[PDB]
Each structure stands twice: as structure tokens, then as C-alpha cells.
Design a protein around this motif. Structure first.
Motif, PDB file in Angstrom:
ATOM      1  N   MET A 186      56.836  66.558   8.423  1.00 32.54           N
ATOM      2  CA  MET A 186      55.658  65.916   9.192  1.00 32.54           C
ATOM      3  C   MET A 186      55.695  64.607   8.741  1.00 32.54           C
ATOM      4  SD  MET A 186      52.059  68.409   8.743  1.00 32.54           S
ATOM      5  CE  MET A 186      52.290  70.071   9.145  1.00 32.54           C
TER       6      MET A 186
ATOM      7  N   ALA B 243      55.235  68.337  16.741  1.00 31.29           N
ATOM      8  CA  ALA B 243      54.148  68.708  15.802  1.00 31.29           C
ATOM      9  C   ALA B 243      54.341  70.126  16.035  1.00 31.29           C
ATOM     10  CB  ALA B 243      52.939  68.270  16.667  1.00 31.29           C
TER      11      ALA B 243
ATOM     12  N   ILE C  21      56.121  62.361  12.451  1.00 30.42           N
ATOM     13  CA  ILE C  21      55.431  62.414  13.506  1.00 30.42           C
ATOM     14  C   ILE C  21      53.896  62.062  12.714  1.00 30.42           C
ATOM     15  CG2 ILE C  21      54.334  64.888  13.137  1.00 30.42           C
ATOM     16  CD1 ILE C  21      55.291  63.273  16.127  1.00 30.42           C
ATOM     17  N   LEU C  22      53.756  62.116  11.459  1.00 27.22           N
ATOM     18  CA  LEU C  22      52.327  61.607  11.007  1.00 27.22           C
ATOM     19  C   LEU C  22      52.671  60.107  10.280  1.00 27.22           C
ATOM     20  CD1 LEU C  22      51.245  64.738   9.108  1.00 27.22           C
ATOM     21  CD2 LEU C  22      50.060  63.329  11.118  1.00 27.22           C
TER      22      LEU C  22
ATOM     23  N   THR D 269      43.611  63.506  13.275  1.00 31.72           N
ATOM     24  CA  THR D 269      42.845  64.447  12.856  1.00 31.72           C
ATOM     25  C   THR D 269      41.367  64.404  13.650  1.00 31.72           C
ATOM     26  OG1 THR D 269      43.985  65.383  11.029  1.00 31.72           O
ATOM     27  CG2 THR D 269      41.657  65.711  11.359  1.00 31.72           C
TER      28      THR D 269
ATOM     29  N   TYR E 155      47.046  68.649  -0.515  1.00 31.16           N
ATOM     30  CA  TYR E 155      48.398  67.930  -0.774  1.00 31.16           C
ATOM     31  C   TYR E 155      48.579  68.268  -2.206  1.00 31.16           C
ATOM     32  CZ  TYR E 155      50.019  65.990   3.497  1.00 31.16           C
ATOM     33  OH  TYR E 155      50.386  65.677   4.970  1.00 31.16           O
TER      34      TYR E 155
ATOM     35  N   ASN F 134      55.033  71.828  12.131  1.00 33.66           N
ATOM     36  CA  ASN F 134      53.975  72.719  11.754  1.00 33.66           C
ATOM     37  C   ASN F 134      54.675  74.146  11.498  1.00 33.66           C
ATOM     38  OD1 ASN F 134      50.791  71.797  11.653  1.00 33.66           O
ATOM     39  ND2 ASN F 134      52.111  70.727  13.189  1.00 33.66           N
TER      40      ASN F 134
ATOM     41  N   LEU G 255      41.541  64.773  17.333  1.00 34.50           N
ATOM     42  CA  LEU G 255      41.473  66.107  17.672  1.00 34.50           C
ATOM     43  C   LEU G 255      40.222  66.941  17.631  1.00 34.50           C
ATOM     44  CD1 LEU G 255      44.975  67.031  16.164  1.00 34.50           C
ATOM     45  CD2 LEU G 255      44.532  66.643  18.692  1.00 34.50           C
TER      46      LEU G 255
ATOM     47  N   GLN H 241      42.382  67.322   3.262  1.00 32.87           N
ATOM     48  CA  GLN H 241      43.877  67.252   3.425  1.00 32.87           C
ATOM     49  C   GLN H 241      44.352  66.542   1.926  1.00 32.87           C
ATOM     50  OE1 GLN H 241      45.183  65.158   6.754  1.00 32.87           O
ATOM     51  NE2 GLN H 241      47.185  65.694   6.577  1.00 32.87           N
TER      52      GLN H 241
ATOM     53  N   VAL I 132      56.693  73.708   8.091  1.00 34.36           N
ATOM     54  CA  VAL I 132      55.937  73.666   6.948  1.00 34.36           C
ATOM     55  C   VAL I 132      55.391  75.050   6.641  1.00 34.36           C
ATOM     56  CG1 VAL I 132      55.415  71.136   7.191  1.00 34.36           C
ATOM     57  CG2 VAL I 132      53.757  72.883   8.010  1.00 34.36           C
ATOM     58  N   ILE I 133      54.896  75.863   7.788  1.00 34.26           N
ATOM     59  CA  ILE I 133      54.316  77.204   7.500  1.00 34.26           C
ATOM     60  C   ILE I 133      55.075  78.281   6.804  1.00 34.26           C
ATOM     61  CG2 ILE I 133      53.023  79.017   8.651  1.00 34.26           C
ATOM     62  CD1 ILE I 133      51.527  76.857  10.517  1.00 34.26           C
TER      63      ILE I 133
END
Ligand SMILES: C=C1CN(S(=O)(=O)c2ccc(C)cc2)CCCN(Cc2ccccc2)CCCN(S(=O)(=O)c2ccc(C)cc2)C1
Lengths: 61, 31, 449
Positions: free
Chosen positions: C60, C286, C63-64, C81, C121, C290, C84, C117, C293-294
Motif C-alpha cells: 500500500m 488498491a 497507492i497510499l 478513507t 498499525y 489489499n 469513501l 488505523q 496484505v490480507i
């Protein structure tokens, strides 16, 4: 059953590309110069900030 | 509500940066 | 929204400019904003016991616009966030002086999720065992990330209220990508090995090898085909992909739109090939990040499970599962070794980008029906057509334009990944599209003047 939709999409994309307004050398040069200027600005500002902050991070940490 | 301008935003960002730096310095001196 | 106003009025807001800020001053404020973002990106957090662990959110970081262990660890996550969450609440009809209340609500929700978040983290073990850091250290890290997210929100508001040339998302993503490319090009960081000094930047390495090594041809070939550090072929590929994306982004279909309500304003409505500018790339990246990471968390915690094994298998790059076939091949030789994976990756990239493009034109309000309604509202007609056949012409052009724009931008990402260009396909495409958005803003301001 997807052969006909795929062929139709290929034909539509080909006709669209043929009917689009492709950039010429003047437009390409103008956009390339603008992109180069923006890339230089952002990338070199970040590069010099990183160079400045490497010794600073070494000192504080 | 509070309506700050761009220069106050720059100043407060620099102040937060300085606060983090002073946190690092204080921890370094404490250790 | 009446139960949230007291908490909506307690966060800072940017005042709208009285006048319309000139383009030069907006460029200056954009430069100042990105400078602040970069400086915060280069400042580490306080309380870090260790950063030796592998980054769980490494995928991420592009993209972040994030940077591990620093004040912009969360990156632009506040902005994304909050947007969204507000859009989802609008879809659920729960959310709705109205603009100020909406902005206050979006800030409050973005900051709440920024706190969440930061907690996630911290609990990922990124900085060390949270039990070993302690409540005080974890709270300090959360406070620093909270204030940094507040600063990110303020910077995005500065950009979007008329002081800057766009949104924080695009600016910061492109800024990080350009920083990465320029760093890989000009890094003075030397990586000592059995040979000797080797600058991590390709151009600096080229100059060093030409100046020091006796066998000049060996020095040139090394500097061009280094497999341990950035290549000169990598920068050459980056420039070539820049040029190709610039060429393909200037494609447009020029509709000769006439006006009926008020006469004598003949014009052109351009339907770009890249109808959704880098939206397919953003959505695809994204999704893949995601999933990455998952899968990494699931493999770390719940290892040996069948569903985890099919979801992904890591070494940290994937070696098997869904996440492996969603990964760009390491090199063209990797494509030669495993052609099935290369075909699956190419098909996934093209199809996902095309699907995201068409779905986004159907969602964001740029569908042919929406454009036809805009034409009807503004009383605009096509020069060689009727006023009732406008929707048919738009249905001919816009859907195919969006599908093929997504297909082409995915193909450009695949090409950049295959060429081994610096910054990958996602980074190059995002950077070029964002800089083109800024160039479009510049030319719009010039045409207005
Ligand atoms: C901001 C993000 C990235 N996402 S995004 O899809 O990737 C995206 C990025 C950029 C753009 C322009 C558009 C979308 C946008 C936000 C989407 N959710 C928000 C959300 C969902 C449900 C309840 C509350 C909030 C979930 C991702 C949270 N993450 S996380 O901390 O990093 C993270 C942490 C754990 C795991 C396993 C994955 C990821 C933060």
C-alpha cells in the motif's frame, strides 16, 4: 458465445482509434515538456528533501 | 468553527515537525 | 447530522480565498504543500523500538503515498478513507451551511478512522511487541499519527479550496512516485560489496564506473545491466513508457458540439481515450494491494490452511496462489519460464482495468446517459446530428472509449512491468496521468485568460 461480443468490441475499438485525434509532434512536445517539468519539480524536491533529512535523521536517531 | 489560512497551516505543520524533533531530542537526552 | 455538529465544529477549517488565486501562486502553494508532505515523510516517529520486521503494508506504500516508520506512515489514508466513508453513508442515506457541516463530518470520520488505523498499525507488531513498547509509547505513536493525519487533511483542503492545483491524493501519490524514480536515478547512497563502491543511483553509478574502472566497456555494460541496483536500461524503459503513455493520453474523440439555447458558440467536446484517468489503475492497485496484505497476514497467522494456501504463498514475493498470478513477472525470462502465469497476469490486468473503467463511468456520473442529460441541460447538440440522437452518439462513443481506455492503460502497465521500468507500471501510469491532469488545469487556466 463470447466470440461475437469480442469481435464487436474489437471493431468498435478499432473504429474509435481510427476516429480519434492522435497527437502530432507539436502537441506531443508540449505535453512531454510539461510532464518533464512536473516530474522534475516533484522528484527533485523529494530527492533534495531526502538528502537533507538523511543526516538529520542520523543526528536525531 | 476555526477558519485558518494557508500560512497558519504551514506554520502548524512546521510546529508539529519541530515537536517531533524535540520529542526525539528529549528521548535521546533521557536515554 | 445534528448529533455530530458539536464535534464537527471543533476541527480546523481552511478559509476560501476571497479572490481567485492566480496560477503562479497556486503552483507555489502546491509546491509548498508537497514540500511539507515530503518533509513529514522523511521524519521518523518517536518510540520506535525496531523496524527490522518486514513491512506488512509494503504493497500500500504506493497507492497510499505512505512511508514506513515516519509521520506519513498512513499516507493519504485520511483523505481516501474520509471520502469513501462519506460516499458510503450517502449511499445508505444516513449522511447528507450544509457544505460546512458535510466537510466537518468528513474530517471527523477521517480522523476517527485515522486513530483506528494507527491502532491497527501499532498492533501489527510493526514497531515491536506492543506489550514491550507499552501504553505510553503506543499512545505517543497514535498521537503523532493522529496529528499527521490532521495535517494531511488540512493540506488536502488547502489544495482543494483554491490554493493548490488539485487534490492531495493525486499530488502526494505522484510526488512519491517521482521521488522514487529520481532517487533510483541519482542516489548517492553507496552499496559496498566485493567489488567496491557502487552508488545506488543509476546515473551516479554510470559516472563513477566510467571515472574509476579501467575497462570502460565493462563499466558501461555493468552500469546498463546491473542486476543488484537500478539499471540504465531501467531508466531508459521508464522514459520510453513515459513517452508512450504521454502519446496515448493525448488521444481524444472531438465531438463538434453546437448550442441551441444560445446561438453562435460552436465548440468541441473531447472524449478522451483514457476516459477515466488512472481510475482503473487506482482501483486495480488498491484491490491487489489489499489482497496482498490480507494474504500476508493470513499466511503469517493462519499458516497451513488450504484456503490460505490458495489465496497466496509467499517466500517477500508470492510464489503460489491467487496472489502469485496477480503479480507482475520478475523479468521477461520469468515470462519465458512460466508462460501460463504471464498470460493469466496479462488477462487479469487488461480485463480488470477495462471492467473498472466501465464500472466507473457507470458510477461516477460520466455515462452516456449522464452526458446526454448534461447536453440537454446546457442546450448543446452535435453539429451534424439531432437533439434526440445525442444519447445514441454518446452510447456509440463513450462506453467503447472507457473500455478501450482501461484496456490500453492496463496494457501500458503490463508493458512497463515487463520492461522492468523504474517505478513499475502502476507508478509510471499514475505519475503521468496526474501530471497530465495538472497540465490540463494549466491549459484550462490559460484558455480562460
Ligand atoms: C486507506 C486505506 C486503503 N484503502 S484502498 O482500497 O486500498 C484505496 C487507496 C487509495 C485510493 C485512491 C483508493 C482506495 C481505502 C480504505 C478501504 N477500507 C477502509 C475501511 C473499511 C471498513 C471499515 C473502516 C474503514 C479498508 C482498508 C484500510 N486501509 S489499511 O490500513 O491500509 C488496511 C488494514 C488492514 C488490511 C487487512 C488491509 C488494509 C487504509
Amino acid at each position: 458465445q463470447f466470440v461475437e461480443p469480442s469481435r464487436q468490441f474489437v471493431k468498435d475499438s478499432i473504429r474509435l482509434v481510427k476516429r480519434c485525434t492522435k497527437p502530432d509532434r507539436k502537441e506531443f512536445q508540449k505535453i512531454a515538456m510539461a510532464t518533464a517539468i512536473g516530474f522534475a519539480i516533484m522528484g527533485f524536491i523529494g530527492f533534495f528533501v531526502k538528502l537533507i533529512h538523511i543526516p538529520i535523521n542520523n543526528i536525531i536517531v | 468553527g476555526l477558519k485558518v489560512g494557508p500560512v497558519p497551516v504551514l506554520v502548524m505543520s512546521l510546529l508539529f515537525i519541530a515537536s517531533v524533533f524535540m520529542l526525539h531530542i528529549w528521548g535521546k537526552y533521557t536515554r | 447530522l445534528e448529533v455530530i455538529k458539536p464535534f464537527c465544529v471543533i476541527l480546523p477549517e481552511i478559509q476560501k480565498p476571497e479572490r481567485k488565486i492566480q496560477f503562479k501562486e497556486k503552483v507555489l502553494w502546491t509546491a509548498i504543500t508537497l514540500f511539507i508532505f515530503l518533509v513529514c515523510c522523511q521524519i521518523p516517529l518517536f518510540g520506535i523500538m525496531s523496524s527490522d520486521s518486514a513491512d506488512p503494508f509494503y504493497w500500500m506504500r504506493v497507492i497510499l503515498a505512505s512511508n514506513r516508520g515516519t509521520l506519513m506512515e498512513l499516507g493519504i489514508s485520511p483523505i481516501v478513507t474520509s471520502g469513501l466513508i462519506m460516499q458510503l453513508l450517502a449511499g445508505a442515506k444516513i449522511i447528507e451551511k450544509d457544505r460546512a457541516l458535510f466537510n466537518g463530518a468528513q474530517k471527523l470520520f477521517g480522523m476517527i478512522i485515522t486513530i483506528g488505523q494507527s491502532i491497527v498499525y501499532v498492533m501489527t507488531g510493526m514497531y515491536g511487541d506492543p506489550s514491550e513498547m507499552g501504553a505510553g509509547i503506543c499512545l505517543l505513536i497514535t498521537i503523532q499519527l493522529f496529528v499527521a493525519g490532521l495535517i494531511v487533511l488540512l493540506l488536502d483542503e488547502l489544495l482543494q479550496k483554491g490554493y493548490g492545483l488539485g487534490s492531495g491524493i493525486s499530488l502526494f501519490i505522484a510526488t512519491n512516485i517521482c521521488e522514487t524514480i529520481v532517487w533510483k536515478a541519482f542516489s548517492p547512497t553507496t552499496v559496498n560489496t566485493g567489488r567496491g563502491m557502487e552508488f545506488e543511483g543509476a546515473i551516479i553509478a554510470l559516472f563513477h564506473l566510467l571515472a574509476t574502472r579501467t575497462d570502460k566497456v565493462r563499466a558501461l555494460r555493468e552500469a546498463f545491466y546491473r542486476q543488484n541496483l537500478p539499471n540504465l536500461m531501467n531508466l531508459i524503459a521508464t522514459i520510453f513508457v513515459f513517452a508512450v503513455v504521454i502519446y496515448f493520453q493525448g488521444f481524444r474523440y472531438e465531438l463538434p458540439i453546437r448550442s441551441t439555447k444560445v446561438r453562435g458558440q460552436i465548440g468541441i467536446y473531447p472524449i478522451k481515450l483514457f476516459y477515466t484517468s488512472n481510475i482503473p489503475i487506482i482501483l486495480q492497485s488498491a484491490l491487489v494491494s489489499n489482497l496482498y496484505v490480507i494474504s500476508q497476514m493470513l499466511s503469517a497467522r493462519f499458516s497451513g490452511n488450504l484456503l490460505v494456501s490458495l489465496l497466496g504463498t509467499w517466500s517477500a514475493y508470492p510464489v503460489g496462489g491467487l496472489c502469485y498470478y496477480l503479480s507482475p513477472p520478475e523479468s521477461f525470462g520469468s515470462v519465458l519460464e512460466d508462460p501460463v502465469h504471464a498470460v493469466v497476469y496479462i488477462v487479469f490486468m487488461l480485463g480488470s482495468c477495462a471492467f473498472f473503467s466501465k464500472t466507473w463511468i457507470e458510477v461516477s456520473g460520466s455515462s452516456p446517459r449522464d452526458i446526454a442529460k448534461q447536453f440537454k441541460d446546457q442546450g448543446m447538440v452535435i453539429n451534424g446530428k439531432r437533439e434526440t440522437s445525442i444519447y445514441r452518439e454518446l452510447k456509440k462513443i463513450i462506453p467503447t472509449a472507457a473500455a478501450f481506455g482501461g484496456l490500453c492503460i492496463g496494457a501500458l502497465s503490463v508493458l512497463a512491468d515487463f520492461l522492468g521500468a523504474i517505478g513499475s507500471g502502476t507508478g509510471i501510469l499514475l505519475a503521468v496521468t496526474i501530471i497530465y491532469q495538472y497540465f490540463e488545469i494549466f491549459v484550462k487556466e490559460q484558455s480562460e485568460v
